[PDB]
């Protein structure tokens, strides 16, 4: 197996409550060991391991490097957030909501597929005859498709009575009002 030597540099920005809290963390990484860090809360380079000590001391001795890094939370993070506000943070893709019955016979499982939505924040609930079901609900984790959409499968273990209406109920920032999709038991299982 060929040997490989890897370097990573990550200029990371953290935002909370709009730009009320903004934090820059610059990370230099050898293979998977973070070795040097610039955290705007700290205001100087810090050696995370011994391998990063010479770089941290050397960069901290360079006044021009320090003041650029210290301004970078505004110059980079806050500047780019204004662009995100007009683009990524405005991205609304409404979820597609689909119910299909399954087994694990007669049907004893319903799968609510909630697909192709953005952003990630979502609330999916199962109702049976207008009463929220809590037991018997199993969800996949939030699934990242990689194309700026997510999906999630929320499953309900069920023993259906003929006439029962099972409702998948989805809340999402793209929606003025929840999506509800109904599955109506046509027989008793």
């Amino acid at each position: 197996s060929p040997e490989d030597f890897v370097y990573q540099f990550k200029g990371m920005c953290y935002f909370t409550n709009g730009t009320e809290r903004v934090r820059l963390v610059s990370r230099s990484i050898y293979n998977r060991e973070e070795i040097v860090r610039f955290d705007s809360d700290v205001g100087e380079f810090r050696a995370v391991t011994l391998l990063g000590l010479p770089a941290a001391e050397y960069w901290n001795s360079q006044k021009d490097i320090l003041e650029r890094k210290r301004a970078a939370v505004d110059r980079v993070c806050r500047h780019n957030y204004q662009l995100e506000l007009r683009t990524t943070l405005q991205r609304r893709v409404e979820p597609t909501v689909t119910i299909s019955p399954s087994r694990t016979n007669h049907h004893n499982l319903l799968v609510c597929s909630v697909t192709d939505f953005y952003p990630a924040q979502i609330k999916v609930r199962w109702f049976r005859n207008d009463q929220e079901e809590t037991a018997g609900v199993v969800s996949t984790p939030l699934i990242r498709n990689g194309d700026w959409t997510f999906q999630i499968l929320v499953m309900l273990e069920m023993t259906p009575q003929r006439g029962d209406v099972y409702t998948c109920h989805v809340e999402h920032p793209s929606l003025q009002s929840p999506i509800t999709v109904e599955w109506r038991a046509q027989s008793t299982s």
Partner: T-cell receptor, first 106, second 112 residues
């Protein structure tokens, strides 16, 4: 781990005093001497550098090869009587030494 | 410099106490340390931007907080005899600084 001269220094006024301190973590980044009068608060005395920080009667120096930190007090005054703390900063840990007490007699 | 109140306090075992620290104007990091004979300086908790940034090894009856003016409070919900100490706060402009400015401390004596 920070280890200091483990005992009271009883020194006549005017003598020159050497404090020593060792640290075990090679990754330790910054180093300081603090000064603390009896039952009072610590006060930053000086940062420590490999060149040797010099400021009046005080000199502090770092040796990364041996992982030693030192403080020199030339021409000691009665007012130098205090507990001298070696303070070592590593990644997310600032460690205060237990201190070396210095008593300057007239 | 750094202002701490109350400067002296007598409490009894089982009581609660709140100590207050006003850092140097402009400083945003406040740390609390406990000073006893025989252990020296022990780090309680550091507070930056109104949240606890780092924590020492003290039990949970020791708690703290930081307000939006960077003033900080320390609390012990239930005091023990061995909590008698000089409680020192230290401020620095930025987080995780080795360059600290200490108040004069709150001298707390806990009696039965």
């Amino acid at each position: 781990e920070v280890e200091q001269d483990p005992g009271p220094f009883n020194v006549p006024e005017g003598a020159t005093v050497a404090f020593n301190c060792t640290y075990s973590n090679s990754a330790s980044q910054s180093f300081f001497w603090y000064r603390q009068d009896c039952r009072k608060e610590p006060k930053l005395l000086m940062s420590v550098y490999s060149s040797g920080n010099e400021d009046g009667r005080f000199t502090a120096q770092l040796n990364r090869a041996s992982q030693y930190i030192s403080l020199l007090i030339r021409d000691s005054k009665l007012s130098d009587s205090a507990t001298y703390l070696c303070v070592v900063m590593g990644f997310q840990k600032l460690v205060f030494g237990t201190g070396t007490r210095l008593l300057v007699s007239p | 410099g750094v202002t701490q109140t109350p400067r002296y306090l007598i409490k009894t075992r089982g009581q609660q106490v709140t100590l207050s620290c006003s850092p140097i104007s402009g400083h945003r990091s406040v740390s609390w340390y406990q000073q006893t004979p025989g252990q020296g300086l022990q780090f309680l908790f550091e507070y930056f931007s109104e949240t606890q940034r780092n924590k020492g090894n003290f039990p949970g009856r020791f708690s703290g907080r930081q307000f939006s003016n960077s003033r900080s409070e320390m609390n012990v919900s239930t005091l023990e005899l061995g909590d008698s100490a000089l409680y020192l706060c230290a401020s620095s402009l930025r987080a995780e600084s080795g360059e600290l400015f200490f108040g004069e401390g709150s001298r707390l004596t806990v009696l039965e």
